[PDB]
Write an enzyme that holds these catalytic residues in place. Structure first.
Site, mmCIF file in Angstrom:
data_model
loop_
_atom_site.group_PDB
_atom_site.id
_atom_site.type_symbol
_atom_site.label_atom_id
_atom_site.label_comp_id
_atom_site.label_asym_id
_atom_site.label_seq_id
_atom_site.Cartn_x
_atom_site.Cartn_y
_atom_site.Cartn_z
ATOM 1 N N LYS A 542 0.878 -1.177 0.000
ATOM 2 C CA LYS A 542 0.000 0.000 0.000
ATOM 3 C C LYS A 542 0.914 1.226 0.000
ATOM 4 C CE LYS A 542 -1.947 -1.716 3.619
ATOM 5 N NZ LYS A 542 -3.426 -1.524 3.648
ATOM 6 N N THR A 650 -9.059 -1.227 0.095
ATOM 7 C CA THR A 650 -9.528 -2.149 -0.940
ATOM 8 C C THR A 650 -8.520 -3.275 -1.132
ATOM 9 O OG1 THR A 650 -8.641 -0.691 -2.660
ATOM 10 C CG2 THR A 650 -11.008 -0.532 -2.190
ATOM 11 N N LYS A 654 -8.842 -7.617 -1.739
ATOM 12 C CA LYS A 654 -8.071 -8.389 -2.720
ATOM 13 C C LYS A 654 -7.391 -9.600 -2.072
ATOM 14 C CE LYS A 654 -6.946 -3.945 -4.962
ATOM 15 N NZ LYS A 654 -5.797 -3.030 -5.281
HETATM 16 O O1 M09 Z 1 -5.072 13.072 -4.826
HETATM 17 N N1 M09 Z 1 -5.830 13.101 -3.621
HETATM 18 O O2 M09 Z 1 -6.146 14.351 -3.033
HETATM 19 C C1 M09 Z 1 -6.236 11.954 -3.055
HETATM 20 C C2 M09 Z 1 -5.703 10.747 -3.508
HETATM 21 C C3 M09 Z 1 -6.108 9.540 -2.937
HETATM 22 C C4 M09 Z 1 -7.049 9.524 -1.911
HETATM 23 C C5 M09 Z 1 -7.420 8.294 -1.349
HETATM 24 C C6 M09 Z 1 -8.508 8.059 -0.305
HETATM 25 C C7 M09 Z 1 -8.629 6.532 -0.265
HETATM 26 O O3 M09 Z 1 -7.424 6.036 -0.870
HETATM 27 N N2 M09 Z 1 -6.855 7.115 -1.622
HETATM 28 O O4 M09 Z 1 -9.765 6.124 -1.060
HETATM 29 C C8 M09 Z 1 -9.935 4.681 -1.139
HETATM 30 C C9 M09 Z 1 -11.129 4.410 -2.061
HETATM 31 O O5 M09 Z 1 -12.334 4.821 -1.409
HETATM 32 C C10 M09 Z 1 -10.135 4.087 0.277
HETATM 33 O O6 M09 Z 1 -10.213 2.661 0.202
HETATM 34 C C11 M09 Z 1 -9.004 4.488 1.228
HETATM 35 O O7 M09 Z 1 -9.349 4.060 2.557
HETATM 36 C C12 M09 Z 1 -8.779 6.014 1.190
HETATM 37 O O8 M09 Z 1 -7.642 6.370 1.993
HETATM 38 C C13 M09 Z 1 -7.586 10.733 -1.447
HETATM 39 C C14 M09 Z 1 -7.181 11.947 -2.020
#
Ligand code: M09
Ligand code: M09
EC number: 2.4.1.1
Lengths: 810, 810
Positions: A542, A650, A654
């Site tokens: 991750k 997510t 997986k």
């Molecule tokens: O470019 N950004 O500002 C940005 C990128 C990625 C995120 C996130 C948030 C997140 O992962 N990446 O979204 C996933 C999909 O819903 C979740 O599974 C994660 O828990 C969450 O941290 C938030 C904001």
């Protein structure tokens, strides 16, 4: 070879072979004498692509004739990975192509490794969009993914001297066979300028123009002959741009930089102008496309009946004031009518509660770049706050809390508040997260408009994340319960009746061993690293972030090493600990954590007393293609975020689908995963959200844990003294200082329970039969976590459309 | 329809139709219901392109097997124009495609108009390279054109308020079906750095690297199944380039700007660093390719037996020290041996004697950008000057005159001197020009090495410049003498026996009238301008420059207008005067001349007394595609440069082949044209080179002519007083001042003879039969001016290879 990969018919194989040879000649302009493996890959890709086109044309004409409600999924990220195998899987062409290439003297799996990942995302959010597109096509929804075609995706990670180095991901270098440029559908996007008030409304004048050129990529559904579209915009300068002569032409780069590069921040907000330009660029081009398609069906009353816009986080939040702008300024609708249409059209998904990730744009940036949008935002705020004041009279602090405009040193616009105000539905991404939204950060909004707030627990596509990456497991499952589960994952519950089946237990364990052997071989070939394939594969992959607590994993690794060194001749279950993930280029602590992991490996991997009992490996350049390799090989999935910080996750899902057991906190979707499988079948440890709250009220004191836990004290003393960096004794001083004095994520607080829980994991692994039976109970209850379930819920509860598993004519 | 366009066989037409439909579906991803004319163009282009591939692959493998001597033509410009029709012509596919598209309900000529010009050149020099490539393929030579793939070619010219405006020629916007990207053959190019001297020679270290990515375009020969390659390099940044993160990726543009834009200067030297980078970029990438291909046949003695490098002007002059660099520094050859190989490999073509066009690079630029090359240039100079000193002892002024290094305020390298020193052959481009080189600017070099100096009179390809643009004329010629002349243009001499043939006279005149009607219709459609198709079409099309004397043409136009206004009811032969051409963006005087032409048109075209007797039109955006339209329609070709200034001209030859008579000075190839046709069949006027020399010795005084010629005085008084610019009286003050006080090109000196000669033109035009008989005598003697003749001479006299008209197997 295997059933789930479809039929290899004589006619099909013959046809595929001749079309492969045709493309090699006419398309690649090569012959078999000078062709390289890459040439062969492209010949195969063009051959498979040909099978998409008829279906693509007929799907889109079907939507034109039937005129269903259209779903527009707006995202700044689409983490697609490779496309070749996925296309073959969804078209039932895998065995046929395998045979055809075999008869040509080629290995298809070798050819598949040549394709570059489409890395147009950072991690979870971008990958969710990609799984969603797959599910929307599989469920026969008239869905369109809209984003930006970045020239450079997420950087390639190299490790030099244990440190992360970044290089440009030049993914388009050899061309992209999957996209179709559509220069004929280019649209203008406006920036800067000023607002002029006339007898008949406002006018936005003296603007700078950038052109938005679309590239279309097909999105095939699973064996239903549906092919939807992902449309990605590329920035282009107009031909009279800056028009001494030479410099004017060279300066075209300034406009075109908008689509040059993906911002590499995972869960962090950087208020840069270029990022704002990207966000408006996607929104402005997309909305013109939406309106054009709607008009080619005057009466905007029916707009929300024919259009749904889903905002993937706040990144495309400007869709709200942009829709208002178009309806009020250009279409001449009254404000109240335009607002009604906007609210009914838009819905917003929140993806995190971390304060530093929330978009709060300085007013001065919006003032200069988008003067009309700022005026519209102010007007939305005034009308919204008038509603709050009427509902909660005299509650002055609520008014300041709920305002879209935040006062301070620099005035900012809260984009999350904008999204809630202008959307008919607001959802979190896992039950615990959605509850946290209503209880904490959006409490005031929930109190005003409770009906708006929903949950939609995340999912993953079982096509990519089972059939594609783990054909062996897919096949042994299909042998018992048939093939229907691939598009109806709840059917995996039928495997509960095989938990005492001796043949199945053997097959499940055999598939895992084969996957581990293949991955151990991959590591030696491409990275020259040797691992024991009989050891427990302990995997945490991750993005690198403090909240994800790779550091807690590090502490356990050192604990294991120290215990071996204390009692060398005592038996311990052998482990291969694998940690992978990219750090944002400007995130110092994340880069220090990567260095720590490699430094621990340098000590542990070369200690003769340890032997093959413990290995620590950093997985370089973690990306979708690598996830497809490592996840099927994993025994233990590390999901160890501080309770209340990981909105969903997510990656967790997986691992569950692919036969790993989970060690995790009660955070994000972990809670629902444990609920589905049963708590006895999950390795749960540590503070719950309520426990974190109690500690915060009292004040978190790391020294207390250091003082009371001798094993923890030893590790801190090793880090501080230079045990893991003899040539640079003080290298990890920042890490120790953070752990001891300003740890927002309470690493020490979960240490004891974590180590204890890990002992229970090792105990179970000593009993292969019982390990595998627990694995079967996890796989069998993973059905809820299909993105088909997730998308069906969005469709019925937000978008107002019914999914369909019915085939289109081939 | 017509014979020369080939056969339309049932099998061929059927096959073309189905492949057209295949590409529309699989390649364009469209159906007939939504397809536009542009989609149809691309479907046709892909269909025709398919016919090239087999021949392209087998031609290149043939060269690999036979290993003939390879010819490398290095040029910074290739002015290719459109490719579709040319490909059809050379493959004998024109009638077949015409029929196939007709049966599909499409007009092929409409589709042909959609293709963008490949405008990778300024004018004559770039177009010569293109004609040369065509002839080399037609003559079966193993020839490779090497240059730069500019993202932006020569600017599109718009006329606003009578003024030239420039816009970017975004020629790649809709894609280029003719090129094949070859990213697998990418090569590194080095810049900057420093020179390190070791035990074993010099080393060039600490360099910045730019990647050169090749794109290959097929060059088909005329119906001989030969398909050669033009390879154009594109600039790419390495992936670790500048590798905060975001800016580093954005800064990749700095490296990639090398191939961004063509410098739009015709016959003028601008000493900019970016231009130097372009010149080294093409040379460094090309030479690595040449050496690789030579090694894949250790012994560099055979290098000149297998390789010829032709330098198109001094622009690729760095090939000389770059070859030395590779042979000495990398291959470890001794200097003397390396030099022998270099001289025998390289040959240099000079294209102008104008001092401002000559490349003289500041030493400080070369010192910083190419430190090793500067050292090599110094060493070449020292050894060359030692030879001069031995041959001409005590002649100290010869030493300074002949030096490659020029002293002064800023030290410069004379690239022409470098080319002569390092080449075994030096040629001019027309007999008079080549003689001028030996008598004047290169006199010292001719005296030292007389054997080096040659003439190769320019030519044009009769495929593009007769068969393609004038099928009507090609057909009436073929009716009498067969088709052989298309690849053996000397056969046109057979038409002398038809000069008294009444049927032929009628046919020649009919074809011209049809061409004039078609062009008059083109003007009304695309530009809304109306012309009398019965008038004499008086045409001057070429880049705008003082030496080309568009101003002299302007003076005649005004003379004609003034004579009409003096005697309105007197009969005059009606004329349409057409002037077209682009001005370099920074060339003020050239831009003023364009304004003058449109200003004269504004007065003349709206004077009711003139009627339809005189029209003055500026032809907007003159380019190859426009030349193909206007040249077949012309009656009178204006070739009126000051004697000794136009090295050759090639536009002149195009007009001769297409049935226009020529009014011209004894300059460039005009001399040889008049020699071929007979002076009685040419309208020759004005000073000869010797007359210009006499005037220069005496001192040119424009006032003398002004004082003695009342008609000339009137015009100058009209310009000065504001007759052609009533709202801005002093607009043309710069023009008058230049004409009166500092005219390098002696416009006034040729005025009287020019006007007199024009009267003789009008007199002949009054007698249609005798006009046409003179036309027949021009067409009949145009054979010498085929680029097939030119290339045969280069092949035999410079390159040491024999041309071949033999077919390769289809
Ligand atoms: O470019 N950004 O500002 C940005 C990128 C990625 C995120 C996130 C948030 C997140 O992962 N990446 O979204 C996933 C999909 O819903 C979740 O599974 C994660 O828990 C969450 O941290 C938030 C904001
Ligand atoms: O970019 N340059 O430095 C440059 C461009 C074009 C030229 C020329 C020279 C010239 O036309 N363009 O070459 C033609 C081909 O030989 C001749 O026919 C012309 O007379 C000559 O002026 C020279 C230099």
């Amino acid at each position: 070879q295997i059933s789930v990969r479809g039929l290899a018919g004589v006619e099909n194989v013959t046809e595929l072979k001749k079309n492969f040879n045709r493309h090699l000649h006419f398309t690649l302009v090569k012959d078999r004498n000078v062709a390289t493996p890459r040439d062969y890959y492209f010949a195969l890709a063009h051959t498979v692509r040909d099978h998409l086109v008829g279906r693509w044309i007929r799907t889109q004409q079907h939507y034109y004739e039937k005129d269903p409600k259209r779903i527009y999924y707006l995202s700044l990220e689409f983490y697609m990975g490779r496309t070749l195998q996925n296309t073959m899987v969804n078209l039932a062409l895998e065995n046929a192509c395998d045979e055809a290439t075999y008869q040509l003297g080629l290995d298809m799996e070798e050819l598949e490794e040549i394709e570059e990942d489409a890395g147009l995302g950072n991690g979870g959010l971008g990958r969710l969009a990609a799984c969603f597109l797959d599910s929307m096509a599989t469920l026969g929804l008239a869905a369109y993914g809209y984003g930006i075609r970045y020239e450079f995706g997420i950087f390639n990670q190299k490790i030099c001297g244990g440190w992360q180095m970044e290089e440009a991901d030049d993914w388009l270098r050899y061309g992209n066979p999957w996209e179709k440029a559509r220069p004929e559908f280019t649209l203008p996007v406006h920036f800067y300028g000023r607002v002029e008030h006339t007898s008949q409304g406002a006018k936005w004048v003296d603007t700078q123009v950038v052109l938005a050129m679309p590239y279309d990529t097909p999105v095939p559904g699973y064996r239903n002959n549906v092919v939807n579209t992902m449309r990605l915009w590329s920035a282009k300068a107009p031909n009279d741009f800056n028009l001494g002569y030479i410099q004017a032409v060279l300066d075209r780069n300034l406009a075109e930089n908008i689509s040059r590069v993906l911002y590499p921040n995972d869960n962090f907000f950087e208020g840069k102008e270029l990022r704002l330009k990207q966000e408006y660029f996607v929104v402005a081009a997309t909305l013109q496309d939406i309106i054009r398609r709607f008009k080619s069906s005057t009466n905007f009353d029916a707009f929300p009946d024919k259009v749904a816009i889903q905002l993937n986080d706040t990144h495309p939040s400007l869709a709200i004031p942009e829709l208002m702008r178009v309806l009020v300024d250009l279409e001449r609708l009254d404000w109240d009518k335009a607002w009604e249409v906007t609210v009914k059209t838009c819905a917003y998904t929140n993806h995190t509660v971390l304060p530093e990730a929330l978009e709060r744009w300085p007013v001065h940036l919006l003032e200069t770049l988008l003067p009309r949008h700022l005026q519209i935002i102010y007007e939305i705020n005034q009308r919204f706050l008038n509603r709050v004041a009427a509902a909660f009279p005299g509650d002055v602090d609520r008014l300041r809390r709920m305002s879209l405009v935040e006062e301070g040193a620099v005035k900012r616009i809260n984009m999350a508040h904008l999204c809630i105000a202008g959307s008919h539905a607001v959802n979190g991404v896992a039950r615990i997260h959605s509850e946290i939204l209503k209880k904490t950060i959006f409490k005031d909004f929930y109190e005003l408009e409770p009906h708006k707030f929903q949950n939609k627990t995340n999912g993953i596509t079982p096509r990519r994340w089972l059939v594609l990456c783990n054909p062996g497991l897919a096949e042994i499952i299909a042998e018992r319960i048939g093939e229907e589960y691939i598009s109806d994952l709840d059917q995996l519950r039928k495997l509960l009746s095989y938990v005492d089946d001796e043949a199945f237990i053997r097959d499940v364990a055999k598939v895992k061993q084969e996957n581990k052997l293949k991955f151990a071989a991959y590591l030696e070939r491409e990275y020259k690293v040797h691992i024991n394939p009989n050891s427990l594969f302990d995997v945490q992959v991750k993005r690198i972030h403090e909240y994800k607590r790779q550091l807690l994993n590090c502490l356990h690794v050192i604990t294991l090493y120290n215990r071996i060194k204390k009692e060398p001749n005592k038996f311990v279950v052998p482990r291969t600990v694998m940690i992978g993930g990219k750090a944002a280029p400007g995130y110092h602590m994340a880069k220090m954590i990567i260095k720590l992991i490699t430094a621990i490996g340098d000590v542990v991997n070369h200690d003769p007393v340890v032997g093959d009992r413990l290995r620590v490996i950093f997985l370089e350049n973690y990306r979708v293609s690598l996830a497809e390799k490592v996840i099927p090989a994993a025994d233990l999935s590390e999901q160890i975020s501080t309770a209340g910080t990981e909105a969903s996750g997510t990656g967790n899902m997986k691992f569950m689908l692919n036969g790993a057991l989970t060690i995790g906190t009660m955070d994000g979707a972990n809670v629902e995963m444990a609920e589905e499988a049963g708590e006895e079948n999950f390795f749960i440890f540590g503070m719950r959200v309520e426990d974190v709250d109690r500690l915060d009220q009292r004040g978190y004191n790391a020294q207390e844990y250091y003082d009371r836990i001798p094993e923890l004290r030893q590790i801190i003393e090793q880090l501080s003294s230079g045990f893991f960096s003899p040539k640079q004794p003080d290298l990890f001083k920042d890490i120790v200082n953070m752990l001891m004095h300003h740890d927002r994520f309470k690493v020490f607080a979960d240490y004891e329970e974590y180590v204890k829980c890990q002992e229970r994991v090792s105990a179970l692994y000593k009993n292969p039969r019982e390990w595998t039976r627990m694995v079967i109970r996890n796989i069998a209850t993973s059905g809820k976590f299909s993105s088909d379930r997730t998308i069906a819920q969005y469709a019925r509860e937000i978008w107002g459309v019914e999914p369909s598993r019915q085939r289109l004519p081939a």
